[PDB]
């Protein structure tokens, strides 16, 4: 019952709040920062109008001579990976859901799906900006391929849970998770607020594809090890692959930026993400529920962020290592 | 030389201007609902939904799947016998008309900024997402093509210079600022203008290239030109489908007038810039096709056939 859940959250109530606190005074620490940099950020955001990645090269309509090979190469690498939800064999799955997965497992996973099927930016704040065809291609496909992800998670939810009676409780007891709110505030902070430099939004976006969900991906690769939910594992593999292709791209584009953000920010955006992500599992879904070690999970998310930081130019802040070998890929 | 070109434009100088004039006083005739818009289901989020499956809008969805299942890349286009036919089978007149028709394709924000952004139904967003993605492959294709047949950028350059002096581009431009880029421009009207961009504003080139299929040539081109057309149709049809869900539809007069102004700029594309004669076609029949195409769209929108002409081509029977 909720009993164990309680014990489990309890074991990680201390660490949770250590974070739950360590975020709060970030809504302020921010107002503080911006307040005293009103002048500086103006200069940057003003020079923004001069980043090649952000201005049309009207000396071009040929629409081929490949100027940005590195980018293009990213488009092709992803155009070549197209896949639909109907390639997902979901047969042995329904079986393992009732005769192999215990009560604890049928819970963790159900919730982790409900998460995926919940979480404008890509299009309206990025695909619109960026004046190089090479990149627009990548983004278009990114938006298109992410819509297939969305279909997938629902198909899945809709395959395993056949009693909407539950499916309903499920989604009700999912919008009370303090993490959603916190994630929300994390976003209004670096993304939805104007006067928010492009380069900073790139770090926040890559953090959404590369950090804000690395915890669920691995949790599902764990089910692969104990050979189960074959269909899920398969979709969960293609998706992860994808969100990686996507994260890497942000990095690649960051690189073309001339006026990059202050390393401090790059590190702080990522960092605040990690903390909300770890807090996902030391509060809402305990990885213990499916045989995982909370300490190692926390450690992975840190690894993942660390990895991203280096991709961005900053330096490993965590300095932890890959606590999982099945995520070696 | 430019001589024949002149004779050809000449034969259709009278008809051209008839139109060239019949557009001008449209920038004025124009100068001469949006609140309820906020109440069209297609335009408002149904927050009583996250499940992101229960298929509410089957008609739409069906459109998405029908198009998700048609995915194709530029690298499936065999462009071998093409390069051959471009030099040893196509005459001077043909190398010209086609070159220019490619340069056109490779020139012509709306789909996304105006539309994909509006329309609060997932079923539709999926379709649009794929639409934007698949249209980017079209763009790549036309350039690949241009880049395969024309290997001397020295030409490729003249080509693109003597292509931005075409009065049609400007006119098409004004046609757009009129129904699309101007604010206070009802959604339903922009749908008619958008469908006109996928279904009418380029029907003339598609057919012109299906004509090369008849006389068996440019096999690669014909093939790409087939998949693309198929696509832009899937796309046009969709607009119609969405128009249907609208509760406050535009005044039939507008629906007819937007389409109509399009047709005229489209016909004028070939009675001024590229004469279909150049590749053995009959300007009278072309003009007649564009009219057929528009006519067909009007009925799709609910209006009535304004031209009443018929399909002057059997190879476009599809």
Q: Quick check: helix, strand or coil at residue B41? A: helix
How far is B60 from A67, CA to CA, in rounded Å? 38
B142 close to B104: Cβ distance less than 8 angstroms: no
Residue B232 in marked binding region: yes
How far is A253 from B217, CA to CA, in rounded Å? 42
Cα angle: A137, vertex B123, A85; to 5 degrees? 70
Residues of A with CB under 8 A from a CB of B: 61-64, 79, 82, 84, 117-118, 123-124, 127-128, 133, 136-137, 140-141, 143-144, 147-148, 150-151, 153-155, 157-158, 167, 171
Q: Which two tokens stand for residue B91?
A: 């005459």
Q: Answer whether B143 sits within 8 Å of A82, measured CB to CB.
A: no
- The active-site residue, picked from A68, A75, A139, A153, is A153
DSSP letter, residue B64? H
Resolution in Å, one decimal place = 3.1
Give the closest residue to B24 by CA, choosing from B171, B230, B129: B171
Q: Quick check: helix, strand or coil at residue A210? A: helix
* C-alpha torsion B256→B261→B263→B265, nearest 10: -170
Q: Answer whether A123 sits within 8 Å of B146, measured CB to CB.
A: no
Q: Answer whether A123 sits within 8 Å of B133, measured CB to CB.
A: no
How far is B85 from B91, CA to CA, in rounded Å? 10
B119 close to B42: Cβ distance less than 8 angstroms: yes
Half-sphere exposure of A302 (CA within 13 A, CB side): 15
B257 close to B212: Cβ distance less than 8 angstroms: no
B312 close to B285: Cβ distance less than 8 angstroms: yes
Place of tokens 């340069």: B103
How far is B171 from A41, CA to CA, in rounded Å? 42
- Chain B, nearest residue to A113 by Cα: B51
- Chain B, nearest residue to A58 by Cα: B107
DSSP letter, residue B78? -
Q: Answer whether A117 sits within 8 Å of B51, measured CB to CB.
A: yes
DSSP letter, residue A85? G
How far is B298 from B99, CA to CA, in rounded Å? 31
Give the closest residue to A117 by CA, choosing from A145, A153, A91, A81: A153
A61 close to B160: Cβ distance less than 8 angstroms: yes
- Choose the CATH number for A1-329 among 1.10.620.20, 3.90.25.10, 1.25.40.420, 3.40.50.12780: 1.10.620.20
Of A118, A144, A154, the CB nearest to B130: A144
Q: Which two tokens stand for residue B158?
A: 């003249």
Alpha helices in A229-320 (DSSP H): 230-256, 263-279, 294-312
Q: How many helices (H) and strands (E) does chain A have?
A: 16, 0
Give the C-alpha distances (Å, rounded to integers) separating A83 from A51, A148, A210, A239, A250: 34, 8, 20, 10, 22
Place of tokens 């629409």: A63
Residues whose CB is less than 8 angstroms from the CB of residue B299 and which lie 6 or more positions away in sequence, other chains included: B305
Please give the backbone phi and psi of residue B107, each rounded to the nearest 5 degrees, phi first: -155, -60
Q: Which two tokens stand for residue B214?
A: 């008849």
How far is A164 from B16, CA to CA, in rounded Å? 63
How far is A119 from A216, CA to CA, in rounded Å? 13
Q: Which two tokens stand for residue A166?
A: 């539950």
Give the C-alpha distances (Å, rounded to integers) separating A33 from A23, A203, B144, B304: 15, 18, 49, 63
Q: How far is CA A285 from the centre of its chain?
A: 17
Please give the backbone phi and psi of residue A197, each rounded to the nearest 5 degrees, phi first: -35, 140
How far is B199 from A10, CA to CA, in rounded Å? 62
How far is B281 from B274, CA to CA, in rounded Å? 11
Q: Which two tokens stand for residue A27?
A: 């809504």
Determined by X-ray
Of A62, A143, A148, the CB nearest to B143: A62
One-letter-per-residue 3-state SS of A129-157? CCCCHHHHHHHHHHHHHHHHHHHHHHHHH
How far is A269 from A204, CA to CA, in rounded Å? 6
- Helix-helix angle A263-279:A178-190, to 10 degrees: 170
Q: Answer whether B51 sits within 8 Å of A150, measured CB to CB.
A: no
A301 close to A196: Cβ distance less than 8 angstroms: no
Q: Answer whether A63 sits within 8 Å of B117, measured CB to CB.
A: no
Give the C-alpha distances (Å, rounded to integers) separating A107 from A92, A174, A225, A303, B73: 19, 12, 18, 26, 41
Q: Which two tokens stand for residue A271?
A: 């960092």
- Helix-helix angle A198-210:A294-312, to 10 degrees: 150
How far is B143 from B22, CA to CA, in rounded Å? 34
User: Using CB atoms within 10 A of its CB, is residue A153 exposed (0-12), middle (13-18) or buried (19+)?
Assistant: buried
Place of tokens 């832009």: B232
How far is B18 from A316, CA to CA, in rounded Å? 71
Q: Is the torsion defined by CA of B184, B188, B190, B193 positive or negative?
A: negative
Residues whose CB is less than 8 angstroms from the CB of residue B238 and which lie 6 or more positions away in sequence, other chains included: B60, B63, B127, B131
- Helix-helix angle B153-161:B92-105, to 10 degrees: 70
Residues of B with CB under 8 A from a CB of A: 50-53, 68, 71, 73, 106-107, 112-113, 116-117, 122, 125-126, 129-130, 132-133, 136-137, 139-140, 142-144, 146-147, 156, 160
Residues whose CB is less than 8 angstroms from the CB of residue A28 and which lie 6 or more positions away in sequence, other chains included: none
Provide the b/e sequence for A31-57 (b: ≥16 CB within 10 Å).
Answer: eeeeeeeeeeeeebeeebeebebeeee
Strand extents, DSSP E, B106-193: none
Domain B1-318 -> CATH class: mainly alpha
* Gap from A143 CA to chain B (nearest CA, Å): 6
How far is B260 from B290, CA to CA, in rounded Å? 10
Q: Which two tokens stand for residue B239?
A: 């607009």
* A136 vs B contacts (CB less than 8 Å): 136
One-letter-per-residue 3-state SS of A164-202? HHHHHHHHHCCCCCHHHHHHHHHHHHHCCCCCCCHHHHH
Give the closest residue to A246 by CA, choosing from A284, A282, A205: A205
Give the closest residue to B125 by CA, choosing from A242, A250, A150: A150
Return the residues preceding each gap in chain B, C–N over 2.5 A, or none.
Answer: 32, 108
């Amino acid at each position: 019952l909720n009993k164990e859940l309680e014990t489990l959250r309890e074991e990680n109530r201390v660490k949770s709040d250590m974070l739950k606190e360590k975020l709060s005074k970030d809504a302020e620490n921010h107002k503080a920062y911006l307040k005293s940099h009103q002048v500086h950020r103006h200069k940057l955001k003003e020079m923004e109008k001069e980043e090649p990645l952000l201005n049309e090269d009207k000396e071009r309509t040929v629409l081929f001579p490949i100027k940005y090979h590195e980018i293009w190469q990213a488009y092709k690498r992803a155009e070549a990976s197209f896949w639909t939800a109907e390639e997902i064999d979901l047969s042995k799955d329904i079986h393992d859901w009732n005769n192999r997965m215990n009560e604890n497992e049928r819970f963790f996973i159900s919730r982790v799906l409900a998460f995926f099927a919940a979480s404008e930016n890509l299009v309206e704040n990025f695909s619109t900006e960026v004046q190089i065809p090479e990149a627009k291609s990548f983004y278009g496909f990114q938006i298109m391929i992410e819509n297939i992800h969305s279909e997938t998670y629902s198909l899945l939810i809709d395959t395993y849970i056949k009693d909407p009676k539950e499916s309903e409780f499920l989604f009700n007891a999912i919008h009370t998770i303090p993490e959603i709110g916190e994630k929300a505030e994390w976003a209004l902070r670096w993304i939805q607020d104007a006067d928010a430099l492009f380069g900073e939004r790139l770090v926040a976006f890559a953090s959404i594809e590369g950090v804000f969900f690395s915890g669920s991906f691995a949790s599902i690769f764990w089910l692969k090890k104990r050979g189960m939910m074959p269909g899920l594992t398969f979709s969960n593999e293609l998706i992860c692959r994808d969100e990686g292709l996507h994260t890497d791209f942000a990095c690649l584009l960051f690189a073309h930026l001339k006026n990059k953000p202050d390393p401090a920010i790059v590190e702080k955006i990522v960092t605040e993400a990690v903390e909300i992500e770890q807090r996902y599992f030391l509060d809402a879904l305990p990885v213990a529920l499916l045989g995982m070690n909370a300490d190692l999970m926390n450690q992975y998310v840190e690894f993942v962020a660390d990895r991203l930081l280096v991709a961005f130019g900053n330096k490993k802040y965590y300095k932890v290592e890959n606590p999982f070998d099945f995520m070696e890929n």
